[PDB]
Amino acid sequence: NYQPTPEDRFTFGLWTVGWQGRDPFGDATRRALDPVESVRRLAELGAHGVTFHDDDLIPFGSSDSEREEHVKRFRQALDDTGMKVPMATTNLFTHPVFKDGGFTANDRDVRRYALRKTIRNIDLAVELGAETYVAWGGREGAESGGAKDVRDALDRMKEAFDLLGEYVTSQGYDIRFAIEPKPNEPRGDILLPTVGHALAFIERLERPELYGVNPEVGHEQMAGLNFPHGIAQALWAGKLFHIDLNGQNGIKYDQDLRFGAGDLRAAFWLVDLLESAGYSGPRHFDFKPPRTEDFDGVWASAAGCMRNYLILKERAAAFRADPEVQEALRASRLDELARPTAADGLQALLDDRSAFEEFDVDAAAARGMAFERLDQLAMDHLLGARG
Amino acid sequence: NYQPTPEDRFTFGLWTVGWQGRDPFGDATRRALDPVESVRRLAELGAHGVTFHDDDLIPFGSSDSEREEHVKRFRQALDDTGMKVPMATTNLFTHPVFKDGGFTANDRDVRRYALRKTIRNIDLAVELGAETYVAWGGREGAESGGAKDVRDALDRMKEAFDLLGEYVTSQGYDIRFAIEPKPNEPRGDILLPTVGHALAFIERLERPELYGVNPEVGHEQMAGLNFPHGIAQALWAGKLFHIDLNGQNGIKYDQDLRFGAGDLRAAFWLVDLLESAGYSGPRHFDFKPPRTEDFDGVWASAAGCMRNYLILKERAAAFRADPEVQEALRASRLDELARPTAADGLQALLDDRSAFEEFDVDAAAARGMAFERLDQLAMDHLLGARG
Amino acid sequence: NYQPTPEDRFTFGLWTVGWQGRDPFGDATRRALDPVESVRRLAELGAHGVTFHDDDLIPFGSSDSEREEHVKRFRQALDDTGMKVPMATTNLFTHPVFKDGGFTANDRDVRRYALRKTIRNIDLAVELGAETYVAWGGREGAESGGAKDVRDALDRMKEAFDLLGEYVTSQGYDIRFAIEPKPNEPRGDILLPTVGHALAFIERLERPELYGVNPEVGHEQMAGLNFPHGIAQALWAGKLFHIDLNGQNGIKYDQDLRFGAGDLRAAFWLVDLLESAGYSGPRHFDFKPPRTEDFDGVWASAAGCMRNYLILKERAAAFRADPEVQEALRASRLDELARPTAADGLQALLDDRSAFEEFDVDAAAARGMAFERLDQLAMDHLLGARG
Amino acid sequence: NYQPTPEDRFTFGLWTVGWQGRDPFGDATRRALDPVESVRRLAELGAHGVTFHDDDLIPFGSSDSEREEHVKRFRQALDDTGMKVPMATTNLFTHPVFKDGGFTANDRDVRRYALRKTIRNIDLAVELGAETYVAWGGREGAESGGAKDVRDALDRMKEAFDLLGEYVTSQGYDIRFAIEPKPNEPRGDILLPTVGHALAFIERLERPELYGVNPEVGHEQMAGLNFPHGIAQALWAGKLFHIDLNGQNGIKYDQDLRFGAGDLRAAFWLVDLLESAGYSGPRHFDFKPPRTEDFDGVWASAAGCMRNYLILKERAAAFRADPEVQEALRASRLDELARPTAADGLQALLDDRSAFEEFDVDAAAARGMAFERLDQLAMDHLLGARG
Ligand SMILES: [Ca+2]
Ligand SMILES: [Ca+2]
Ligand SMILES: [Ca+2]
Ligand SMILES: [Ca+2]
Ligand SMILES: [Ca+2]
Ligand SMILES: [Ca+2]
Ligand SMILES: [Ca+2]
Ligand SMILES: [Ca+2]
Ligand SMILES: [Ca+2]
Ligand SMILES: [Ca+2]
Ligand SMILES: [Ca+2]
Ligand SMILES: [Ca+2]
Ligand SMILES: [Cl-]
Ligand SMILES: [Cl-]
Ligand SMILES: [Cl-]
Ligand SMILES: [Cl-]
Ligand SMILES: [Cl-]
Ligand SMILES: [Cl-]
Ligand SMILES: [Cl-]
Ligand SMILES: [Cl-]
Ligand SMILES: [Cl-]
Ligand SMILES: [Cl-]
Ligand SMILES: [Cl-]
Ligand SMILES: [Cl-]
Ligand SMILES: [Cl-]
Ligand SMILES: [Cl-]
Ligand SMILES: [Cl-]
Ligand SMILES: [Cl-]
Ligand SMILES: [Cl-]
Ligand SMILES: [Cl-]
Ligand SMILES: [Cl-]
Ligand SMILES: [Cl-]
Ligand SMILES: [Cl-]
Ligand SMILES: [Cl-]
Ligand SMILES: [Cl-]
Ligand SMILES: [Cl-]
Ligand SMILES: [Cl-]
Ligand SMILES: [Cl-]
Ligand SMILES: [Cl-]
Ligand SMILES: [Cl-]
Ligand SMILES: [Cl-]
Ligand SMILES: [Cl-]
Ligand SMILES: [Cl-]
Ligand SMILES: [Cl-]
Ligand SMILES: [Cl-]
Ligand SMILES: [Cl-]
Ligand SMILES: [Cl-]
Ligand SMILES: [Cl-]
Ligand SMILES: [Cl-]
Ligand SMILES: [Cl-]
Ligand SMILES: [Cl-]
Ligand SMILES: [Cl-]
Ligand SMILES: [Cl-]
Ligand SMILES: [Cl-]
Ligand SMILES: [Cl-]
Ligand SMILES: [Cl-]
Ligand SMILES: [Cl-]
Ligand SMILES: [Cl-]
Ligand SMILES: [Cl-]
Ligand SMILES: [Cl-]
Ligand SMILES: [Mn+2]
Ligand SMILES: [Mn+2]
Ligand SMILES: [Mn+2]
Ligand SMILES: [Mn+2]
Ligand SMILES: [Mn+2]
Ligand SMILES: [Mn+2]
Ligand SMILES: [Mn+2]
Ligand SMILES: [Mn+2]
C-alpha cells in the first residue's frame, strides 16, 4: 500500500511542513511549528530525515546560549526518532539586508556578511552529519537592466563559491555543495536560472569537483523546461548531488505543490530516470502544503509526496520490465541510440559510402519511429490500464 | 539617420529574407528568391554579408555540376557586391530523414549521414571564408518520454561534435563551431534548450576551445529567460562566438520578428551589453519578414533590423556616457559590484568582525538601492526624453 | 479493455489522421490520405464519425464535377461504415489570400470571399448531416500594433457572424455555430484568444442563441489557462456546443498531441466534468499524430485518443462514486459551495449579525479546507492506487 | 518635460506606494506609510487622486471610534491637497478567513461575511466620492481539481454580484462595479482569469449595465495575452469602467512594475488606444515600487509611472498625426477594415460574382499588407528617431 520507510531516503525541509502560509497577498494561516514536532511527525510518516536553513533551526539574531539550546533540542529529536540531516542550507533571502542579493549584492559589506553567515552554518551542517550543502541564490538578479552587471555579478558569485570551497578544504570537511537554479521569483530574473546555467558556472570554479546542482522540479518547469531532460543532463555531467521534488502547474509563480501534483507524467518520467540511473541521494521534498490546509492537511500533503513517489516507482519499474515495452523500445531504436555513431572512427566514416553517397535517405525517412505505440504503453503502465 | 554600412558587420541568412512564408497552418505567400538577388539587395541596404544552410545555397540532391554552378554564381554575386560570408550551417531539420534528429537520431545510419552532410558543408564554408560554423539541432529531442534516453542522446551529440572537431583539426581549418540552443519547436522539447545547457555541454567535449554558443534572442525568450543575462554569461565564459538577432513576444511559437520588435527594452539592454563588452562578431539577423508582406516589405523588414540596432546603439552609448547616469550607477553601487568581495582572503574575512559580529545588518538593509531612478534614466535615454 | 464503440461519440477531423507532417521547419513525412480510407480506418477503430474543412474534402479550386465526385465517394464511405459527420468547418487560413484574415482581413474583398466560401460549405455540411459548424479564425489578428484596429476588426467579425446567422435562418437550417478560440499561432496574437473572449463576443451578436464555443484543450493551455475551468464557464453559460480534445505540454507552439498526452491530470478533470455535466456532444479529437510516425503510428495515436478518454472516464466515475471521496467532499464543504449564499435575501443578510457583527472570523479561518486529502484520493483513483 | 498635473487623472492605490516590500520569500524592507503622508506626497508629484481597499484606510478590526478618526484624518488630507478618491475596493484576500475565497469560499458563512464587508465599504466609497467600486477576487479559485466546482462557484459569484447590484440600487447610489480579472496568484488558477471571462460573466448578471471590467496590464500579460487587444474588446463592449496600469515582464509571478517598465511597446499601443478611444476614466497605477528601494525610490517609481504615460501619449499622438503614417495606414488598408464587409446585405453578397465566382484570389493574395513599413514608422515615433 505504498508505505514509505526510512530506507526510501525521503527527506523534508523544516520550512516545508513548517510553512505558515504567508503568500504574495495574505497573512499566515497556520501557527509556527517547533522543529522538534516536525521531526517527530515526519518520522511517524516514514521519512528518513529533515533539512534546514540556518534560520529555520535557530531564530535569526539568537544568542550563543539560545543557539546551543535550539541545536540541543533538535539533536535530541533526531536521536529519539532515528531521523538524519543529509543536507542543510543558508537563508540568504528573507532578511531585508539581502534585498539585492547575498553573494552578488551590489554592497560589498553585504556580500562579506553573506559568506560569514554561510560559513557559520556549514560548520553546523557538518556537526549534524550533512553530506550536501545547498545554495539557492533567490535574491541574486534584478528587476531592471542597469541594476546588475551580470559579468561582474558572476565574478562575485565565483569568488564566493571559491572561498566556500577553500573553507571546506581548509577544515577537512567531506561536505559538497549543490547550487540550486531558479529562473525568477523573488527577483524579476535570477542568476543561474536553469540547470544548464548552474552546470556551466560550476565548470569555471577553481575546484569544480566540490560542486553540483540541486535541481527543483518546479523551478525548471517555471521556464517551461523539461525537468527529466535537465536531470538527465545533470546525471550525464555527474553533478546530481541532491534534488528537490515537488509539483508545478506550468509557467507561473512558484507553487511548490506536493510531489506528483502538477505535471504528473513529468513526475513519472523523473522517477523512471532517477531509478534507472541509480540515483542514491535523498529524495527531498521542497514543497508547501497549501495555505487552505490546517495541520492535519500539512501531514496529509507530506504523506502524499512520498506515496506518489512510490506509486510512480512501481509503475516505471513495471514499464521497463514489460517484455512488450522492451520490444517497443527496440522497434523505436532506443537500442541503436545507445550504440556509438562511429566507433570505426572519422576516416572510416568519411570512406563509408553507405553513410552518404549510397545512403537511401528516402528509405530511412519512410521508417516510422513507433513512438506513439511506445508512449501509450507508458500511459497504460502509469494508469494501471494494461489490457 | 541610422544608415547601416558594411563596417557595422550586419549579416543575414539567405533563409531569412528568402523565407517564402510557409507557417504552421498556411502555404507560401512569396516566390523563392535566387541567392544572387538576395546578396545584391542586402548589399544595397548596407549589409556586410550573408550566411547559409547548405540546402539554401545548393538545392538538396544537386549533382556535382549543379553544385559547382550554384556556388560559382553565388561567389560572383559576393565579388560583385563586396559581401562576405562569415558563417554557414547545415540543414539537419527539413528533410524527413531528420524527423527524429540528425546527430541524435535514434537510427545510427541517420546519425552517420548527418555527420557526412555537415562535413561536406564545412569544406564549402571554409572555401567561402566563414570563420564560424553554426549547429542548430532543431530536431534533437522528443515529444514523449520513452522516445529519447537523453543521457544516450548526449553521448551521441558529444560523439558528433568531437568528430567534427577532429575533422577541422585534421584539415588545418581555422573555423570554430557555435552551438545554437532552443527550448522547443519543432520538437516538443529540444536538447540543449538554453544558453546554459549548451555552455555546460561544451565543457565535456574533447577540445572545448573549438566550440562556443550561437544564442538567438527569440529562443531564450521562448523559455521566458532574460536574453541579455544569458549573453552576459556566454561572454563571461568567453564563448559568444556568434549571435542571432530578432524579436519575440513572449513564450509562444518562434516568431523570428525583425530585431527591435518583440521585447524592445531587452533589445536595448542587449545592444548596451554587446557594445560595452566589445563583441566583435557579426550582428547576424535570423528573422522572418512576416508572411503578410510582399518583397517590398521583406526589404523594409530587413532594413528595420539594422536601423533598430543602430538606434539602440546610440541610446545605450548616450546612457553610459551621461554624467547623471554615471552618478546614479555609483548611487546604486554598481562600482562596488565590480570590486572583489574578499581580496584580503578567506582568513582575513573570517577574522573581520565588521563582516559579522559587528556588522550592522539593519543599517545596511535601510540603504535603498536607487534602482528605479537609474532605470527611469535608462528609459528616458531609450525614448529620447531626457528632461 | 477500454474498447471504443460508435456509441461513445468519438469523432476525428480528416485533417488529423490525414496530417502529412509539415511543421514549422520540415517537409511532409507521410503521403496524403484519401478521405475514404480515413473513414474506413477510423470506423475500424470504433470511431463514431469524422469532420472536415471544405478544403480537406474537396481540393481547393475543384470544378463542380470534381466536387460532386469527391462528395459522392465520401458519402459512399460513410454509408459503407455507418460513420456520421456531426460537424464541419471552413478553411480560412491555408490559402495565401487569408494571410491577414478571413472575416477580419483588412481587404474588404477578402472578407466578402471568406463569407461566400463559408456559406458554400455550410450548405454541404447540412447535406451531410452536421449539427455544428465550427469557425476557427486562425488568421484573425496581428503581429504588430498598427496593422489591426481591434474594435474595427470585432465590428467586422460581428458583421460576418451576423450574416451567417441570417443565412442559416433564411434557409431553415437547424445547424448552430461554434467559435473556436486560440491565443496565438499562426498570428502573433489571435482575436478572441480564449473561451472567455469568445463567450463575451457571442453576447453582442444579433441572434446569440445560434452561437456557442468550440474550445480546444491545447489552445486554452497555450495561454496557461485551466481548461476544465474554461469548460465549466462554457457549460455555465450553456454554450458548450462542441469540443476539441488533444494534449499540450504547456505554453509553447500548438502541439496537438493525442488526448491524454500533455497535462494528464487536466485531462482527468476535464473528463470528470464532461461526464458529470452530461455533455452530449461529440468527443472530437483535433490532434496530429507526430511526424515521427508512419501510418501504423497514425492509427495507434488515434486509438490512444479514445482509449485515454475511456480510462479517464472510468477513473473519474470511480472517484465520484467512492463513499470515502463523498465524505471528503463534505469535509471540504463542496456541498456548501452548491448552496445559495443568501436565499434569505439582501435585507435578511444585512440584518444578520452572524454574518458580520458576531461572525467569529478566527474560528472560520482556523477550519482547514482538507483539499490535500481530497486531491490525493483523486490521485489514487486516477492511478488505480486505492489502498 | 512630461510633468503631470491633476488634469491628467493619474491615481494610485494607497497599497502601491505604501507596499512595505513583503514578497513570496522575504520580510518588509520599508516602514508602513500613514495614508495622510501618501496623499500629500502623491499630490506633490502631480497625482489627481488615490484609491483604497477598506483595510488600507481602516486597520482591520478597528472600533467605530478608530474608524471615524482614520476617515476624518484622510478626508482632511484630501481637502488639504485637492486629491480625489475615484475608486475604492474591498480586501477579500489578506485575512486568513478568505483562504478559499470571499464570494466563492466553500464555507457559506465566509461568503456572507465577504458580502457584508464589501457592503460596508461601498457606503464609505460613496461617502468619499468614488464613481467605481473594484472587485479583484484574488482568492476565488483552486490549487486542485476537486476543491472547487466551478459551475457552483460561478453561481455563488453571480449571486454575490447580483446582491451588490441590488444593494446599490436600493440606496440610490450612482457607483458602478468593475470586476478585475487575473489568471493565477495567489490561487493556482483564479476564476474569471481574463478580460474575456469577466466580460462574459457580466452578461449573466441580473443588471449587467452596473458592471464593467477593471483590467490590469500585468494580469492579462501573465496569461501571455495582448493587453491592448483585451482593452479594445472591453471598449468594444462598452465595459472599460476603470483600468490598472503597471508593467510585467512576461509569464511569471505578478511583478507590478511601474508603468512603462515591462513590455514597453505594449505600453505604447495601450496609450495609443486609450487616447484614440477617448477613455475618460482614471489612469490608475496598481504597482509596487521594488523592495530594493527606500522611500526616495518609492516616489521616484511613482513619478516614473506618470512620466512614462505622458511620453507614450506624446509619441502615439505624433504617430497618428504624421501624414506619412496616415499614408502607410491607407497602404495597409486600415481604412478598409473600418468599412462594412456587406452593407449591401446578404442577398446582394450571395449574388455578387466578384465575391466568389469571379474573385481573383491570386491577385488578392499577391497584395502585400505593408505592415512592416507601418510598424517601423511606429518604432521610429516611439524612439524619437524619425529620419
Ligand atoms: Ca482538521
Ligand atoms: Ca552502448
Ligand atoms: Ca552499416
Ligand atoms: Ca508592394
Ligand atoms: Ca574590478
Ligand atoms: Ca571595511
Ligand atoms: Ca510500420
Ligand atoms: Ca444547490
Ligand atoms: Ca446560520
Ligand atoms: Ca535615499
Ligand atoms: Ca466606418
Ligand atoms: Ca466591388
Ligand atoms: Cl526513494
Ligand atoms: Cl502573517
Ligand atoms: Cl494564526
Ligand atoms: Cl493552532
Ligand atoms: Cl574595506
Ligand atoms: Cl558559464
Ligand atoms: Cl567537475
Ligand atoms: Cl550524478
Ligand atoms: Cl495538480
Ligand atoms: Cl511527460
Ligand atoms: Cl486541511
Ligand atoms: Cl489553516
Ligand atoms: Cl554593429
Ligand atoms: Cl506552400
Ligand atoms: Cl506564390
Ligand atoms: Cl512574385
Ligand atoms: Cl554497420
Ligand atoms: Cl553538461
Ligand atoms: Cl573552453
Ligand atoms: Cl566571448
Ligand atoms: Cl512588436
Ligand atoms: Cl528589460
Ligand atoms: Cl508588404
Ligand atoms: Cl505576400
Ligand atoms: Cl465518450
Ligand atoms: Cl512538404
Ligand atoms: Cl513522402
Ligand atoms: Cl507511403
Ligand atoms: Cl464595391
Ligand atoms: Cl465583448
Ligand atoms: Cl445566448
Ligand atoms: Cl452547454
Ligand atoms: Cl506527454
Ligand atoms: Cl489538474
Ligand atoms: Cl510509427
Ligand atoms: Cl513517417
Ligand atoms: Cl492621462
Ligand atoms: Cl515582514
Ligand atoms: Cl523595517
Ligand atoms: Cl524608516
Ligand atoms: Cl443558516
Ligand atoms: Cl459566461
Ligand atoms: Cl451590459
Ligand atoms: Cl468603455
Ligand atoms: Cl523593464
Ligand atoms: Cl507591441
Ligand atoms: Cl531606493
Ligand atoms: Cl528599503
Ligand atoms: Mn520552489
Ligand atoms: Mn528548493
Ligand atoms: Mn527562431
Ligand atoms: Mn537561429
Ligand atoms: Mn491546436
Ligand atoms: Mn481545433
Ligand atoms: Mn498585479
Ligand atoms: Mn489590480
GROMACS .gro file of N, CA and C and ligand atoms in nm, chain B residues 22 94 96, chain C residues 20-22 26-29, ligand 38:
model
   31
  409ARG      N    1   0.575   2.994  -4.555
  409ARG     CA    2   0.501   2.875  -4.506
  409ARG      C    3   0.507   2.871  -4.352
  481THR      N    4   1.504   1.991  -4.215
  481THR     CA    5   1.391   1.998  -4.310
  481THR      C    6   1.356   1.860  -4.366
  483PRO      N    7   1.268   1.489  -4.432
  483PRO     CA    8   1.202   1.390  -4.348
  483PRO      C    9   1.295   1.287  -4.282
  794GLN      N   10   0.001   1.535  -4.299
  794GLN     CA   11   0.117   1.481  -4.368
  794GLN      C   12   0.248   1.510  -4.294
  795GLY      N   13   0.244   1.592  -4.189
  795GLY     CA   14   0.362   1.610  -4.105
  795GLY      C   15   0.449   1.729  -4.144
  796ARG      N   16   0.395   1.826  -4.217
  796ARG     CA   17   0.468   1.953  -4.239
  796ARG      C   18   0.460   2.039  -4.111
  800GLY      N   19   1.004   2.174  -4.146
  800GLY     CA   20   1.025   2.047  -4.213
  800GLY      C   21   0.915   2.009  -4.309
  801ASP      N   22   0.955   1.926  -4.404
  801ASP     CA   23   0.867   1.878  -4.507
  801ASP      C   24   0.781   1.760  -4.460
  802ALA      N   25   0.682   1.726  -4.543
  802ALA     CA   26   0.592   1.616  -4.512
  802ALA      C   27   0.670   1.486  -4.490
  803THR      N   28   0.624   1.406  -4.393
  803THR     CA   29   0.680   1.274  -4.366
  803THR      C   30   0.583   1.162  -4.403
 1586CL      CL   31   0.630   1.903  -4.787
   0.00000   0.00000   0.00000
